[PDB]
Write a protein that binds this DNA or RNA. Structure first.
Length: 49
RNA sequence: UCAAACUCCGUGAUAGCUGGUUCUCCCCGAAAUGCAUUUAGGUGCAGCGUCGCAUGUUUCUUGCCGGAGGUAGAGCUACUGG
């Protein structure tokens, strides 16, 4: 019989959150931003070239 | 404390700048170029990476073939000049 502990999300339904800045074995020490620039502390507008 | 005091608030001011950004392993893996920029230590796009999808050897290497060049070299009584 189907109880609450039998319920599971479907495969691929749930992907783990990527946690940046949590070590160099992951997206660590820059969070995929690279080193410097405007793009290292802010985001650049799309309306700007 | 003074080329405009101090305090609170606006306010977590803004900083193309500096610094920092914390556990793991597996696979792949750059760039530091071009163009433009009140631009030149920034940024957009392209190039280069990855992932996915589609296509599938088209890529690449070698041989052969067809081709255009004007460098090296050479030449100048073949031009311009010396």
């Amino acid at each position: 019989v189907i109880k609450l502990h039998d319920l599971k999300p479907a495969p691929g339904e749930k992907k783990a959150k990527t946690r940046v800045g949590r070590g160099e074995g992951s997206k660590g020490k820059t969070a995929g931003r690279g080193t410097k620039g405007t793009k290292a502390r802010k985001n650049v507008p799309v309306m700007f070239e």
